[PDB]
Every structure is written in C-alpha cells, then in structure tokens.
Amino acid sequence: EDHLAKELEDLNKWGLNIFNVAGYSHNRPLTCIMYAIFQERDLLKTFRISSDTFITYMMTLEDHYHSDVAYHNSLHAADVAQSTHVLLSTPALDAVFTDLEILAAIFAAAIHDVDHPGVSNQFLINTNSELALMYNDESVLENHHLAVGFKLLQEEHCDIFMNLTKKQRQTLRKMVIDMVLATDMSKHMSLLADLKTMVETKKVTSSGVLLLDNYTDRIQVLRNMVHCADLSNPTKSLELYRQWTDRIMEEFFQQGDKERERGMEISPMCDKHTASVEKSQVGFIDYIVHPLWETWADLVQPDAQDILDTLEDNRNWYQSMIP
Ligand SMILES: COc1ccc(C(=O)Nc2c(Cl)cncc2Cl)cc1OC1CCCC1
Ligand SMILES: [Mg+2]
Ligand SMILES: [Zn+2]
Secondary structure, eight states, X not given: OHHHHHHHXXXXXXXXXXXXXXHHTTSOHHXXXXXXXXXXXXXXXXXXXXXXXXXXXXXXXXHTSOTTSSSSSHHHHHHHHXXXXXXXXXXXXXXXXXXXXXXXXXXXXXXXXXXXXXXXXXXXXXXXXXXXXHTTTSSHHHHHHHHHHHHHTSSGGGOXXXXXXXXXXXXXXXXXXXXXXXXXXXXXXXXXXXXXXXXXXXXXXXXXXXXXXXXXXXXXXXXXXXXXXXXXXXXXXXHHHHHHHHHHHHHHHHHHHHHHHTTOOOOTTTXXXXXXXXXXXXXXXXXXXXXXXXXXXXXXXXXXXXXXXXXXXXXXXXXXXXX
C-alpha cells in the first residue's frame, strides 16, 4: 500500500525497517522483500524465472519458517536477505560478482534458517533428537535448512532455477551449501582468521575496487558476507537492534526453560533467573560482532565506517543500561 511503498524506497539501504515491511505485507516479509530485491536487481529477467513460480516458491519457503519461534522466523530470513542485498552493492565490491553469485547469496540468505525449531545445535545433540542422529552432530541445523530449501525446488510448480544451465545449477548449489554451512557459529573463529588473512593480502584496482582472482576468493567473501548479515542486528539503528534483542532473548530463555524442565544443565545466557540482557549484548558485540565487522570494514574500507560507528554507539547504549 502507500506505507509499504514508502518503506521499500529504503530497499537498497541499511536503514530499511523490516518490522514495518512485515506489518504491511500480511506478515509475509520474506516473500515481499525477496520479490522487491529480485525486481530491483532484474534477476527474474536475467535467469528467466517465472513470476508466479518465484512467488509460489517464496511463499512456501516462508510458510516453512515457524511463526511461533521468537527470533528464527521469517522476519529474520527477510532481514538477512535484505542486508545481504545491500552488502552486495558495497562500492569496494562493484562488478566483482557474476549475476549467478549474486543470485546464490541472496537465495542462501533467504533459506538459511528455514524450519528452525527455536533450539540450538547443542540442545538437539544433547536430547538425541532425530535431526542430530540424522546429521551425525555436525552442523545439524544448517544442513537441515539447506535440505528443506533445496527439497522445495523439486516440484516443477516451484523450480525457480529450471532455466539455469546444468553447469549453473551445479555451481549455484555448491555456492549456497557453502554459504549456509558457514552460518554455523562453531565455524565463526576460523572464518574470521581466514577473513583476516584475506585482508592482509588485499589487492585493489586503481578505482578502489577489490581484485578477486578465482572462485576460492569470491566464495570466501560471499560466505563472510552472509555471516555478517546474519550477525548484523547490532549494526542497525538502536530502535531495530532492541527489538531483535527482545527476540533473541525470548527464544534463548524458552530453550532455557526446556533445559530446566528436562533437568539438563542450563547454558548461562539461556537462564532467565540470572542472565543480564545488557551485559550479554555488550559481550556479544565485544567478542563476536565487533571483531567481525571491523575486519569486514578493512576489506571494504571506508564503505562500512557508518556501520562501525553505529555499532560502537549501540554498544555504549547497552553498557550505560548496565548498573
Ligand atoms: C540481538 O542479539 C543476538 C542476535 C543474534 C545472535 C546469534 O547468536 N545468532 C546466531 C545464532 Cl543464534 C545461531 N547461529 C548463527 C547466528 Cl548469527 C545472538 C544475539 O545475542 C546474543 C545471544 C544472547 C546474548 C547475546
Ligand atoms: Mg542459523
Ligand atoms: Zn540466521
């Protein structure tokens, strides 16, 4: 409507408010934002993706995120997808990626947490869930999200890549699997050490645009790009960041409650009777988010300085809320 259209004028901006798009799209944010992103970038045209087919796939994908899970629902997928869309336009990365890689990244963002049950890999492993047994305790959820996303492409009424070549579809699938498996937090520390090595030997053309020799280098920047998007909540305006915080805490505390009911050990940031929301966000920024974004900023400097300044300001707000 008039409000949804005013809000999507920010489609290519970090300042986009996804909670507002959700309000004006019948709580179908993922479908609305993916369709806006694909039109903006001409991906339907480029890959002969039918409009009805793409919408039918996106609405089914969306319906497979659980609406009664406080944080890992379709609003988070929508946010990571839109955030990824903006990152891909960063001046330092201009003309580096093929249209195929741009398509895989945004697609990956969208499916990256589908059918998330609101509990962590460790909880599924310690409770002997069917998923942990299925995936042998390794990147349990991530493998599951990929499995569902790619499974949904099997029916013809839903195959949005049916017009890619075979070499393209295979190249796509490889890239998407690689990006989503990289969202597993147990991989965070080595992805970052690898990102730091990429900065160390960064080469740029005369116009301030990164030089990415082969596929190895590009997929490395893309995995890291979806990972930053996944970890982008604290880099957004304070107003958005706080709603995201409320949401991750509601989910984590629910798991905490399930751990207790089952008499399991409770992870300190999941225990609602003792955990500080404010200290936890400060630690989250100091030990995970800042270290990561600081490195992303070096890679694409100075494109992410605004983001780094917002992150620091948001850090200081949570610190001042701590007695
Ligand atoms: C707004 O706050 C948060 C947002 C996201 C996450 C987070 O861990 N996300 C995440 C998860 Cl839960 C699993 N895999 C990958 C990612 Cl990026 C964690 C957040 O806060 C932490 C967890 C509770 C205390 C601070
Ligand atoms: Mg995830
Ligand atoms: Zn996620």
